[PDB]
Amino acid sequence: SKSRKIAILGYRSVGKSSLTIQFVEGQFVDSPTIENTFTKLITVNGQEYHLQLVKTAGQDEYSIFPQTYSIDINGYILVYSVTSIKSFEVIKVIHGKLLDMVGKVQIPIMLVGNKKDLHMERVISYEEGKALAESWNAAFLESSAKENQTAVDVFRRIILEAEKL
Ligand SMILES: Nc1nc2c(ncn2[C@@H]2O[C@H](COP(=O)(O)OP(=O)(O)O)[C@@H](O)[C@H]2O)c(=O)[nH]1
């Protein structure tokens, strides 16, 4: 089995913890906001993976980008909320500072718009975030931390993008 380490980046309250618990624990529960690493076995294309999932502390436009992430990470999930215009604007900034940090080592990157279950609360269309991912040449998905199958699909997509390198 292979070992891979995945950093989950994003603004606060966009659902980094909830997506990662929905994937690791199989369930949607609460009870962090402080960085935490989760382990998880998964098979992608018949290949077994040991995953260290780093759910980061949550970054704003000003919070410095930590180098530690760059040093050992194999893929980055950038999550925003489809109910928060601020988190979408923040993920653009996060992306530039992460490219500023690894330089241009063509590292697996993926954009996720979370909370797609909140139909009445949506302010960002699917197409708006899909255009953003394509201008980055990154994979795009909309997820809901209430729906296990969209959580699982985010995490096996970032490993798919990692095998391609
Ligand atoms: N309805 C809905 N609520 C969510 C979703 N993801 C997170 N939440 C809620 O939004 C808040 C987000 O908190 P959290 O998951 O810790 O986000 P984090 O700060 O980025 O780690 C919590 O109250 C969650 O219950 C989702 O997909 N759908």
Side-chain angles (χ1 to χ4, degrees), residues 1-11 13-58 60 62-66 69-70 72-104 106-165:
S1 66
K2 294 169 178 173
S3 184
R4 299 295 182 269
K5 197 171 199 188
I6 294 101
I8 298 103
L9 299 164
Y11 192 47
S13 284
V14 311
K16 297 179 306 291
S17 326
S18 306
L19 270 171
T20 307
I21 274 89
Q22 176 69 256
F23 172 56
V24 170
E25 200 151 344
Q27 296 150 340
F28 176 50
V29 278
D30 270 308
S31 337
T33 254
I34 294 286
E35 201 221 74
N36 199 50
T37 299
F38 297 89
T39 51
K40 176 75 176 196
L41 268 55
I42 193 180
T43 290
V44 181
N45 287 4
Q47 176 61 51
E48 195 193 340
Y49 291 93
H50 265 91
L51 299 186
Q52 286 173 63
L53 300 177
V54 190
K55 163 228 146 299
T56 60
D60 47 77
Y62 308 100
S63 65
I64 194 82
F65 218 109
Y69 310 167
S70 172
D72 33 316
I73 292 323
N74 297 125
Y76 301 89
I77 304 174
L78 305 207
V79 32
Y80 65 96
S81 181
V82 313
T83 64
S84 161
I85 259 151
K86 184 76 188 297
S87 66
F88 192 73
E89 302 172 294
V90 156
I91 212 62
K92 293 169 172 183
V93 184
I94 294 181
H95 176 258
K97 303 206 282 185
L98 174 84
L99 279 180
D100 287 329
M101 186 181 64
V102 306
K104 275 99 85 179
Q106 47 208 62
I107 195 86
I109 177 91
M110 182 197 181
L111 187 64
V112 176
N114 195 35
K115 312 199 178 164
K116 84 176 224 286
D117 55 295
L118 294 176
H119 305 298
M120 301 303 166
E121 209 158 286
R122 186 185 280 264
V123 298
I124 299 152
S125 58
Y126 175 99
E127 297 74 22
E128 185 177 359
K130 184 185 185 77
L132 189 66
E134 300 309 304
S135 73
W136 298 351
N137 195 47
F140 183 64
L141 244 54
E142 279 193 345
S143 59
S144 158
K146 302 202 171 189
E147 300 153 36
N148 178 259
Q149 194 45 256
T150 72
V152 174
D153 279 348
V154 169
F155 287 94
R156 44 202 183 195
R157 183 66 184 275
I158 195 62
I159 297 154
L160 275 176
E161 305 296 314
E163 288 177 11
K164 294 183 192 168
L165 269 295

